[PDB]
Each structure stands twice: as C-alpha cells, then as structure tokens.
Scaffold this motif. Structure first.
Motif, PDB file in Angstrom:
ATOM      1  N   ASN A   1       0.802  -1.229   0.000  1.00 26.51           N
ATOM      2  CA  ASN A   1       0.000   0.000   0.000  1.00 26.51           C
ATOM      3  C   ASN A   1       0.833   1.276   0.000  1.00 26.51           C
ATOM      4  N   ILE A   2       1.561   1.556  -1.073  1.00 27.99           N
ATOM      5  CA  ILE A   2       2.544   2.633  -1.075  1.00 27.99           C
ATOM      6  C   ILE A   2       2.098   3.812  -1.935  1.00 27.99           C
ATOM      7  N   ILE A   3       1.686   3.566  -3.177  1.00 28.39           N
ATOM      8  CA  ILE A   3       1.314   4.671  -4.056  1.00 28.39           C
ATOM      9  C   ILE A   3      -0.125   5.086  -3.772  1.00 28.39           C
ATOM     10  N   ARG A   4      -0.312   6.338  -3.346  1.00 32.75           N
ATOM     11  CA  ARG A   4      -1.644   6.806  -2.971  1.00 32.75           C
ATOM     12  C   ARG A   4      -2.151   7.942  -3.854  1.00 32.75           C
ATOM     13  N   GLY A   5      -1.287   8.892  -4.209  1.00 28.75           N
ATOM     14  CA  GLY A   5      -1.692  10.061  -4.950  1.00 28.75           C
ATOM     15  C   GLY A   5      -1.157  10.059  -6.372  1.00 28.75           C
ATOM     16  N   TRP A   6      -1.749  10.929  -7.191  1.00 29.07           N
ATOM     17  CA  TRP A   6      -1.358  11.122  -8.582  1.00 29.07           C
ATOM     18  C   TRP A   6      -1.729  12.537  -8.999  1.00 29.07           C
ATOM     19  N   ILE A   7      -1.048  13.045 -10.026  1.00 31.69           N
ATOM     20  CA  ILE A   7      -1.392  14.318 -10.648  1.00 31.69           C
ATOM     21  C   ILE A   7      -1.273  14.211 -12.162  1.00 31.69           C
ATOM     22  N   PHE A   8      -2.309  14.656 -12.873  1.00 27.70           N
ATOM     23  CA  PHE A   8      -2.382  14.506 -14.322  1.00 27.70           C
ATOM     24  C   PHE A   8      -2.490  15.880 -14.970  1.00 27.70           C
ATOM     25  N   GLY A   9      -1.397  16.344 -15.573  1.00 25.80           N
ATOM     26  CA  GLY A   9      -1.439  17.648 -16.204  1.00 25.80           C
ATOM     27  C   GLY A   9      -0.207  18.128 -16.940  1.00 25.80           C
ATOM     28  N   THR A  10      -0.406  19.151 -17.775  1.00 24.06           N
ATOM     29  CA  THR A  10       0.612  19.667 -18.682  1.00 24.06           C
ATOM     30  C   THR A  10       1.747  20.350 -17.929  1.00 24.06           C
ATOM     31  N   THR A  11       1.436  21.402 -17.179  1.00 21.62           N
ATOM     32  CA  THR A  11       2.466  22.165 -16.493  1.00 21.62           C
ATOM     33  C   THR A  11       2.543  21.890 -15.000  1.00 21.62           C
ATOM     34  N   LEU A  12       1.440  21.441 -14.386  1.00 12.35           N
ATOM     35  CA  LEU A  12       1.370  20.932 -13.008  1.00 12.35           C
ATOM     36  C   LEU A  12       1.836  21.978 -11.986  1.00 12.35           C
ATOM     37  N   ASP A  13       1.574  23.239 -12.321  1.00 13.06           N
ATOM     38  CA  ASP A  13       1.777  24.322 -11.368  1.00 13.06           C
ATOM     39  C   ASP A  13       0.693  25.386 -11.493  1.00 13.06           C
ATOM     40  N   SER A  14      -0.561  24.952 -11.669  1.00  8.09           N
ATOM     41  CA  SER A  14      -1.743  25.816 -11.823  1.00  8.09           C
ATOM     42  C   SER A  14      -1.609  26.808 -12.979  1.00  8.09           C
ATOM     43  N   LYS A  15      -1.059  26.362 -14.113  1.00 10.95           N
ATOM     44  CA  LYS A  15      -1.047  27.179 -15.321  1.00 10.95           C
ATOM     45  C   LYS A  15      -1.667  26.473 -16.522  1.00 10.95           C
ATOM     46  N   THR A  16      -1.744  25.144 -16.509  1.00 14.45           N
ATOM     47  CA  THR A  16      -2.487  24.391 -17.510  1.00 14.45           C
ATOM     48  C   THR A  16      -3.162  23.258 -16.746  1.00 14.45           C
ATOM     49  N   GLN A  17      -4.140  22.600 -17.374  1.00 16.92           N
ATOM     50  CA  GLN A  17      -5.084  21.712 -16.708  1.00 16.92           C
ATOM     51  C   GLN A  17      -4.428  20.511 -16.052  1.00 16.92           C
ATOM     52  N   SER A  18      -4.379  20.545 -14.725  1.00 19.93           N
ATOM     53  CA  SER A  18      -3.518  19.682 -13.938  1.00 19.93           C
ATOM     54  C   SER A  18      -4.288  19.032 -12.795  1.00 19.93           C
ATOM     55  N   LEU A  19      -4.699  17.791 -13.020  1.00 19.38           N
ATOM     56  CA  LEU A  19      -5.517  17.009 -12.100  1.00 19.38           C
ATOM     57  C   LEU A  19      -4.738  16.653 -10.838  1.00 19.38           C
ATOM     58  N   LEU A  20      -5.465  16.326  -9.764  1.00 21.54           N
ATOM     59  CA  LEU A  20      -4.940  15.664  -8.571  1.00 21.54           C
ATOM     60  C   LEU A  20      -5.845  14.496  -8.213  1.00 21.54           C
ATOM     61  N   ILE A  21      -5.300  13.286  -8.270  1.00 23.73           N
ATOM     62  CA  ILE A  21      -5.996  12.070  -7.855  1.00 23.73           C
ATOM     63  C   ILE A  21      -5.247  11.518  -6.657  1.00 23.73           C
ATOM     64  N   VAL A  22      -5.928  11.375  -5.527  1.00 22.17           N
ATOM     65  CA  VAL A  22      -5.348  10.698  -4.377  1.00 22.17           C
ATOM     66  C   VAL A  22      -6.328   9.661  -3.840  1.00 22.17           C
ATOM     67  N   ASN A  23      -5.910   8.397  -3.881  1.00 21.45           N
ATOM     68  CA  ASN A  23      -6.643   7.299  -3.256  1.00 21.45           C
ATOM     69  C   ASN A  23      -6.181   7.272  -1.805  1.00 21.45           C
ATOM     70  N   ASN A  24      -6.699   8.213  -1.030  1.00 22.30           N
ATOM     71  CA  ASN A  24      -6.275   8.346   0.344  1.00 22.30           C
ATOM     72  C   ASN A  24      -6.969   7.284   1.198  1.00 22.30           C
ATOM     73  N   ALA A  25      -6.603   7.243   2.482  1.00 15.71           N
ATOM     74  CA  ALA A  25      -7.053   6.213   3.414  1.00 15.71           C
ATOM     75  C   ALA A  25      -8.559   6.195   3.634  1.00 15.71           C
ATOM     76  N   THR A  26      -9.249   7.312   3.439  1.00 15.95           N
ATOM     77  CA  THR A  26     -10.697   7.332   3.572  1.00 15.95           C
ATOM     78  C   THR A  26     -11.428   7.663   2.280  1.00 15.95           C
ATOM     79  N   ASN A  27     -11.149   8.810   1.671  1.00 18.02           N
ATOM     80  CA  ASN A  27     -11.982   9.305   0.589  1.00 18.02           C
ATOM     81  C   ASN A  27     -11.248   9.267  -0.734  1.00 18.02           C
ATOM     82  N   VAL A  28     -12.050   9.240  -1.786  1.00 15.66           N
ATOM     83  CA  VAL A  28     -11.601   9.470  -3.147  1.00 15.66           C
ATOM     84  C   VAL A  28     -11.621  10.975  -3.367  1.00 15.66           C
TER      85      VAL A  28
END
Lengths: 147, 49, 49
Positions: A1-28
């Motif tokens: 159970n090691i990889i929990r979070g992810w980010i999907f995006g072009t520039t990944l610093d709030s300048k182009t469309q940059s997702l955040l996916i985290v399969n955290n311990a409780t919520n999606v």
C-alpha cells in the motif's frame, strides 16, 4: 500500500489543466483543478508503538486551491494501510488511453505472489470507467506515500 | 436560482438519480431559445441519460 | 440582471493569449501582452486586461 496520490497535467503548477488524484485512506479525492505544487510530490502517514495506530499528518501537496473544473468526491471507507514486507502481492495497474478528449481509466487488480520484478503471464486491461474531460494534457507525475 | 456565475468562470452542477421532464419548461419561466443538438428534442422523456 | 446604473458584476474575457480546450476553466487575470514590451503587471503599452 505505497502509491496513494497522482497528478495529471501539462504544467502541473496551476497554469495548464492539472488534475490531482489521491486514493487516500478514507476518501476518493479526484480534482481536475488549478493546483500549485512543491518540488517532489509525496503523501504522509505515521505509526505509533503503544497502539498500532497509523495517523495521517502530511500535507505539502498544494499551497493554494480555489478553482475546480471536475471534482469527484466519493464514499469514505477504511483502508488497511499496510507496509508489510515479504513476497510481492498486489498489482493495481492503471492503463490510460485518451482518445477524443475523454481520459479513460481501466481496472485490473490481482493478489499475485512472487519476490521481485514484474511477473509474466496474460492479464487483460479491460475497460472500467471514463472521466469525460476535454482538456490540455502533456505530462503527469505521481504522488507516493511516506510511511 | 438568483445568480449564476460569469462566462470566464462558468458554474458546474452534478445531476443524477432523479426523474426529469421538459413539459414543465412552460410554467416557471418562458424560454427564448430551446434547441437540442444530436437527439430528437421531444424524446427526452423516452431515454435514460 | 439589468440595473439602472448597470450590472458590472459579470465579466467576459476580452482576449486570451492562447485558445481553449472543451470543458475547461481559467481565471488567471495577467496583463495581456498585445505586442512588444512584456508587461509583468504594469499596464503600459501593449499591456491590456
């Protein structure tokens, strides 16, 4: 159970469309949102001795969050929160095709058993779900957890 | 409702698990333009979106 | 939404440096570099909002 979070995006610093996916311990917490990041992304949990309690502490992912374009807030539940060493047991493989804008997500999850580098044999990558976004994607990074 | 959001930052809402109808688009307000692309527009009560 | 002094609470983006993708939102209000003399938030010449 090691990889929990992810980010999907072009520039990944709030300048182009940059997702955040985290399969955290409780919520999606899946957030196609304007997100500002530090150097190398991580997650964080901490473990005690008097009780065997895993406690959730660390948040150095985003400093700023106002906007959201596709938010996804699902059911809370219990995560077993392992760190258990031994034989390799879990493949949670997430094959990504994005044809005609809609970013797609597969599912294939198996209690495997070996020691090291990826086992052989057939394993299907059959369709699971489609997040129907239409956005600018060039890169992505992954957020690991720190146990 | 009372106020939407602007055009540069449009507003988003999730809709599921409910029954809809277009026959009640005639009482609370009169709409000026009502066009549906890609589907027969008076068949909304006949499918499952 | 039509006031006697005007309703100035809604904004449209006049120009944008690039084009868009479908299902997208940006609210970055940086000074629009129309030509030469890059702005960095000064609103001089070739520097619009």
């Amino acid at each position: 159970n090691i990889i929990r979070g992810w980010i999907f995006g072009t520039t990944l610093d709030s300048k182009t469309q940059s997702l955040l996916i985290v399969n955290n311990a409780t919520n999606v917490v899946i957030k196609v949102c304007e997100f500002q990041f530090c150097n190398d992304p991580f997650l964080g949990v901490y473990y005690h001795k008097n009780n065997k309690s895993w406690m959730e502490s660390e948040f150095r992912v985003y400093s700023s969050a106002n906007n959201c374009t596709f938010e996804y807030v699902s059911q809370p539940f219990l995560m077993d929160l392992e760190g258990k060493q031994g034989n390799f047991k879990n493949l949670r493989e997430f094959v990504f095709k994005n044809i005609d804008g809609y970013f797609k997500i597969y599912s294939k999850h198996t209690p495997i058993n070996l020691v090291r580098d990826l086992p052989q044999g057939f394993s299907a990558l059959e369709p699971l779900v489609d997040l129907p976004i239409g956005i600018n994607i060039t890169r992505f990074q992954t957020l690991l957890a720190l146990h | 409702a009372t106020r939407f959001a602007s055009v540069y930052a449009w507003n988003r809402k999730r809709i599921s698990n409910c029954v809809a109808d277009y026959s009640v688009l005639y009482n609370s307000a009169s709409f000026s333009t009502f066009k549906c692309y890609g589907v027969s527009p008076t068949k909304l009560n006949d499918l499952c979106f | 939404d039509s006031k006697v002094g005007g309703n100035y609470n809604y904004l449209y983006r006049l120009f944008r440096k690039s084009n868009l993708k479908p299902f997208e939102r940006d609210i970055s209000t940086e000074i629009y570099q129309a030509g030469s003399t890059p702005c960095n938030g000064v609103e001089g010449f070739n520097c619009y909002f």
